[PDB]
Amino acid sequence: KLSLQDVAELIRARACQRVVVMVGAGISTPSGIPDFRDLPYPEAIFELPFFFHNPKPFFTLAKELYPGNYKPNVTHYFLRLLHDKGLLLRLYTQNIDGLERVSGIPASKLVEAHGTFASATCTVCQRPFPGEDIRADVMADRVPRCPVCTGVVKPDIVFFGEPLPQRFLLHVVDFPMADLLLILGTSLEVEPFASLTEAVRSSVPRLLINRDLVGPLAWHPRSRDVAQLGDVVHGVESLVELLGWTEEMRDLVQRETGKL
Protein backbone atom coordinates (compact mmCIF):
# COMPACT_ATOMS: atom_id res chain seq x y z
CA LYS A 1 0.00 0.00 0.00
CA LEU A 2 0.98 3.66 -0.34
CA SER A 3 2.56 5.45 2.61
CA LEU A 4 2.56 9.15 3.54
CA GLN A 5 6.16 9.09 2.26
CA ASP A 6 4.94 7.91 -1.15
CA VAL A 7 2.38 10.73 -1.37
CA ALA A 8 4.91 13.36 -0.33
CA GLU A 9 7.25 12.14 -3.07
CA LEU A 10 4.47 12.32 -5.65
CA ILE A 11 3.97 15.98 -4.72
CA ARG A 12 7.66 16.85 -4.44
CA ALA A 13 8.24 15.36 -7.91
CA ARG A 14 5.09 17.03 -9.29
CA ALA A 15 3.74 13.64 -10.28
CA CYS A 16 0.60 15.00 -8.61
CA GLN A 17 0.11 18.65 -9.54
CA ARG A 18 -3.68 18.85 -9.62
CA VAL A 19 -4.46 18.33 -5.97
CA VAL A 20 -8.03 18.63 -4.78
CA VAL A 21 -8.56 19.21 -1.08
CA MET A 22 -11.57 18.67 1.12
CA VAL A 23 -11.62 20.15 4.61
CA GLY A 24 -13.96 20.39 7.54
CA ALA A 25 -14.06 21.75 11.07
CA GLY A 26 -11.17 19.52 12.14
CA ILE A 27 -8.72 21.87 10.41
CA SER A 28 -10.02 24.82 12.43
CA THR A 29 -9.97 23.33 15.94
CA PRO A 30 -6.22 24.20 16.11
CA SER A 31 -7.37 27.80 15.56
CA GLY A 32 -9.55 27.55 18.68
CA ILE A 33 -12.87 26.98 16.87
CA PRO A 34 -14.58 23.87 18.34
CA ASP A 35 -15.92 21.39 15.78
CA PHE A 36 -19.33 19.68 15.99
CA ARG A 37 -18.05 16.07 16.01
CA ASP A 38 -33.56 27.82 23.35
CA LEU A 39 -32.25 25.38 20.74
CA PRO A 40 -34.41 22.20 20.39
CA TYR A 41 -31.63 20.22 18.73
CA PRO A 42 -28.18 21.14 17.32
CA GLU A 43 -29.19 21.12 13.64
CA ALA A 44 -31.76 23.84 14.42
CA ILE A 45 -28.93 26.38 14.18
CA PHE A 46 -28.89 25.99 10.37
CA GLU A 47 -32.61 25.52 9.86
CA LEU A 48 -34.39 28.39 8.16
CA PRO A 49 -37.81 27.91 9.84
CA PHE A 50 -36.15 27.86 13.25
CA PHE A 51 -34.01 30.88 12.30
CA PHE A 52 -37.16 32.81 11.38
CA HIS A 53 -38.69 31.71 14.68
CA ASN A 54 -35.58 32.62 16.70
CA PRO A 55 -32.42 33.88 14.96
CA LYS A 56 -30.58 34.56 18.23
CA PRO A 57 -28.87 31.12 18.49
CA PHE A 58 -27.47 31.41 14.97
CA PHE A 59 -26.25 34.92 15.61
CA THR A 60 -24.49 33.86 18.81
CA LEU A 61 -22.55 31.46 16.58
CA ALA A 62 -22.06 34.13 13.91
CA LYS A 63 -20.58 36.37 16.63
CA GLU A 64 -18.21 33.64 17.76
CA LEU A 65 -17.28 32.86 14.17
CA TYR A 66 -17.13 36.26 12.51
CA PRO A 67 -13.97 36.99 10.43
CA GLY A 68 -11.27 38.68 12.47
CA ASN A 69 -12.11 36.60 15.52
CA TYR A 70 -9.79 33.71 14.63
CA LYS A 71 -6.45 33.28 12.84
CA PRO A 72 -5.67 30.55 10.27
CA ASN A 73 -3.35 27.82 11.59
CA VAL A 74 -0.53 25.82 9.99
CA THR A 75 -3.10 23.57 8.28
CA HIS A 76 -4.47 26.58 6.36
CA TYR A 77 -1.00 27.81 5.58
CA PHE A 78 0.04 24.42 4.25
CA LEU A 79 -2.87 24.62 1.81
CA ARG A 80 -1.74 28.15 0.98
CA LEU A 81 1.75 26.81 0.25
CA LEU A 82 0.15 24.14 -1.97
CA HIS A 83 -1.48 26.97 -3.94
CA ASP A 84 1.76 29.03 -3.99
CA LYS A 85 3.62 26.06 -5.46
CA GLY A 86 0.90 25.81 -8.13
CA LEU A 87 -0.26 22.33 -7.07
CA LEU A 88 -3.74 23.23 -5.80
CA LEU A 89 -6.55 22.67 -8.25
CA ARG A 90 -9.27 23.48 -5.75
CA LEU A 91 -9.94 23.53 -2.04
CA TYR A 92 -13.44 22.51 -0.99
CA THR A 93 -14.46 23.54 2.47
CA GLN A 94 -17.45 22.81 4.69
CA ASN A 95 -16.18 25.44 7.10
CA ILE A 96 -17.88 28.80 7.48
CA ASP A 97 -15.05 30.30 9.53
CA GLY A 98 -13.54 31.71 6.32
CA LEU A 99 -10.01 30.92 7.44
CA GLU A 100 -9.10 29.64 3.95
CA ARG A 101 -9.41 33.06 2.33
CA VAL A 102 -7.86 34.82 5.34
CA SER A 103 -4.79 32.59 4.77
CA GLY A 104 -4.56 34.28 1.37
CA ILE A 105 -5.78 31.53 -0.95
CA PRO A 106 -7.55 33.27 -3.89
CA ALA A 107 -11.31 32.87 -4.17
CA SER A 108 -10.86 31.14 -7.55
CA LYS A 109 -9.23 28.23 -5.75
CA LEU A 110 -11.85 28.06 -3.01
CA VAL A 111 -15.21 26.42 -2.96
CA GLU A 112 -16.94 27.50 0.23
CA ALA A 113 -19.64 24.86 0.06
CA HIS A 114 -21.55 26.08 3.12
CA GLY A 115 -21.36 29.78 2.28
CA THR A 116 -19.70 32.78 3.88
CA PHE A 117 -19.92 35.48 6.55
CA ALA A 118 -18.15 37.84 4.13
CA SER A 119 -21.59 38.82 2.75
CA ALA A 120 -25.20 38.98 3.99
CA THR A 121 -28.70 39.10 2.48
CA CYS A 122 -31.98 40.57 3.74
CA THR A 123 -34.41 37.71 4.33
CA VAL A 124 -37.35 39.83 3.14
CA CYS A 125 -36.35 42.07 0.22
CA GLN A 126 -33.19 40.11 -0.79
CA ARG A 127 -30.95 43.21 -0.65
CA PRO A 128 -27.26 42.07 -0.49
CA PHE A 129 -24.91 43.56 2.10
CA PRO A 130 -21.15 43.39 2.86
CA GLY A 131 -20.52 41.37 6.02
CA GLU A 132 -18.75 44.42 7.48
CA ASP A 133 -22.17 46.09 7.28
CA ILE A 134 -23.72 43.94 10.02
CA ARG A 135 -20.54 43.47 12.07
CA ALA A 136 -21.30 46.01 14.81
CA ASP A 137 -24.72 44.48 15.53
CA VAL A 138 -23.51 40.88 15.45
CA MET A 139 -20.62 41.68 17.81
CA ALA A 140 -22.91 43.90 19.93
CA ASP A 141 -25.23 40.88 20.24
CA ARG A 142 -27.91 42.63 18.17
CA VAL A 143 -29.89 40.93 15.42
CA PRO A 144 -29.04 43.01 12.29
CA ARG A 145 -32.10 44.43 10.52
CA CYS A 146 -32.47 45.62 6.93
CA PRO A 147 -32.58 49.40 6.32
CA VAL A 148 -35.17 48.93 3.58
CA CYS A 149 -37.74 46.52 4.95
CA THR A 150 -36.75 45.84 8.60
CA GLY A 151 -36.31 42.15 7.69
CA VAL A 152 -33.55 40.12 9.40
CA VAL A 153 -30.25 40.36 7.53
CA LYS A 154 -28.76 36.87 7.42
CA PRO A 155 -25.11 36.01 6.54
CA ASP A 156 -24.79 34.04 3.30
CA ILE A 157 -24.45 30.79 5.25
CA VAL A 158 -26.09 27.90 3.42
CA PHE A 159 -28.87 26.50 5.60
CA PHE A 160 -30.12 22.91 5.64
CA GLY A 161 -32.35 22.31 2.60
CA GLU A 162 -31.07 25.44 0.81
CA PRO A 163 -29.20 25.45 -2.55
CA LEU A 164 -25.44 24.92 -2.26
CA PRO A 165 -23.49 27.85 -3.83
CA GLN A 166 -23.03 27.95 -7.61
CA ARG A 167 -19.34 27.17 -7.20
CA PHE A 168 -20.05 23.78 -5.58
CA LEU A 169 -20.88 22.47 -9.05
CA LEU A 170 -17.18 22.82 -9.93
CA HIS A 171 -16.91 19.34 -8.40
CA VAL A 172 -18.06 17.75 -11.68
CA VAL A 173 -14.89 18.94 -13.39
CA ASP A 174 -12.56 19.19 -10.41
CA PHE A 175 -12.77 15.74 -8.89
CA PRO A 176 -12.18 13.76 -12.13
CA MET A 177 -9.31 16.17 -12.99
CA ALA A 178 -7.62 15.65 -9.62
CA ASP A 179 -4.43 13.59 -9.48
CA LEU A 180 -4.48 13.59 -5.67
CA LEU A 181 -7.27 14.00 -3.15
CA LEU A 182 -6.44 15.36 0.27
CA ILE A 183 -9.14 15.05 2.93
CA LEU A 184 -8.46 16.96 6.17
CA GLY A 185 -10.45 17.19 9.40
CA THR A 186 -13.87 16.12 8.17
CA SER A 187 -16.20 13.52 9.62
CA LEU A 188 -17.67 13.22 6.08
CA GLU A 189 -21.17 13.18 7.55
CA VAL A 190 -22.56 16.17 5.72
CA GLU A 191 -23.98 15.43 2.27
CA PRO A 192 -23.66 16.21 -0.45
CA PHE A 193 -20.16 17.41 0.40
CA ALA A 194 -19.11 14.04 1.84
CA SER A 195 -19.61 11.68 -1.08
CA LEU A 196 -17.28 13.82 -3.19
CA THR A 197 -14.57 11.48 -1.85
CA GLU A 198 -15.81 8.91 -4.38
CA ALA A 199 -15.66 11.32 -7.33
CA VAL A 200 -11.90 11.08 -8.00
CA ARG A 201 -10.70 8.43 -10.48
CA SER A 202 -10.01 4.89 -9.33
CA SER A 203 -6.28 5.47 -9.87
CA VAL A 204 -6.03 8.61 -7.74
CA PRO A 205 -4.42 8.52 -4.24
CA ARG A 206 -6.72 9.70 -1.47
CA LEU A 207 -4.92 10.92 1.64
CA LEU A 208 -6.95 11.30 4.81
CA ILE A 209 -5.49 13.33 7.65
CA ASN A 210 -7.97 13.06 10.47
CA ARG A 211 -8.53 11.81 14.00
CA ASP A 212 -10.29 8.77 12.56
CA LEU A 213 -11.01 6.76 9.39
CA VAL A 214 -14.31 8.24 8.22
CA GLY A 215 -17.00 7.72 5.61
CA PRO A 216 -16.39 5.88 2.30
CA LEU A 217 -12.66 5.78 3.12
CA ALA A 218 -13.70 3.46 5.99
CA TRP A 219 -16.28 1.23 4.33
CA HIS A 220 -15.12 1.34 0.75
CA PRO A 221 -11.30 1.74 0.77
CA ARG A 222 -9.43 1.86 -2.51
CA SER A 223 -6.00 0.53 -3.33
CA ARG A 224 -4.22 3.89 -3.07
CA ASP A 225 -5.85 5.37 0.03
CA VAL A 226 -3.46 6.60 2.76
CA ALA A 227 -4.66 7.32 6.27
CA GLN A 228 -2.62 9.53 8.58
CA LEU A 229 -4.62 9.37 11.78
CA GLY A 230 -4.01 11.67 14.71
CA ASP A 231 -4.00 15.38 15.31
CA VAL A 232 -4.40 17.16 11.97
CA VAL A 233 -1.53 19.54 12.79
CA HIS A 234 0.72 16.57 13.59
CA GLY A 235 -0.34 15.04 10.25
CA VAL A 236 0.41 18.20 8.27
CA GLU A 237 3.63 18.75 10.25
CA SER A 238 4.61 15.22 9.22
CA LEU A 239 3.63 15.85 5.59
CA VAL A 240 5.54 19.13 5.46
CA GLU A 241 8.65 17.48 6.88
CA LEU A 242 8.48 14.67 4.28
CA LEU A 243 7.97 17.30 1.60
CA GLY A 244 10.96 19.22 2.96
CA TRP A 245 8.78 22.37 3.15
CA THR A 246 9.49 23.33 6.76
CA GLU A 247 11.59 26.38 5.87
CA GLU A 248 9.12 27.49 3.17
CA MET A 249 6.25 27.18 5.70
CA ARG A 250 8.14 29.30 8.26
CA ASP A 251 8.76 31.99 5.64
CA LEU A 252 5.11 32.00 4.58
CA VAL A 253 3.72 31.93 8.09
CA GLN A 254 6.01 34.76 9.22
CA ARG A 255 4.99 36.95 6.27
CA GLU A 256 1.28 36.33 6.85
CA THR A 257 1.24 37.08 10.57
CA GLY A 258 1.26 40.83 9.90
CA LYS A 259 -2.01 40.91 7.96
CA LEU A 260 -4.00 39.21 10.74
Partner: peptide
Protein backbone atom coordinates in the same frame (compact mmCIF):
# COMPACT_ATOMS: atom_id res chain seq x y z
CA UNK B 1 -30.44 22.60 -7.56
CA UNK B 2 -27.94 20.81 -5.23
CA UNK B 3 -29.12 21.47 -1.68
CA UNK B 4 -27.54 20.96 1.74
Amino acid sequence: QPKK
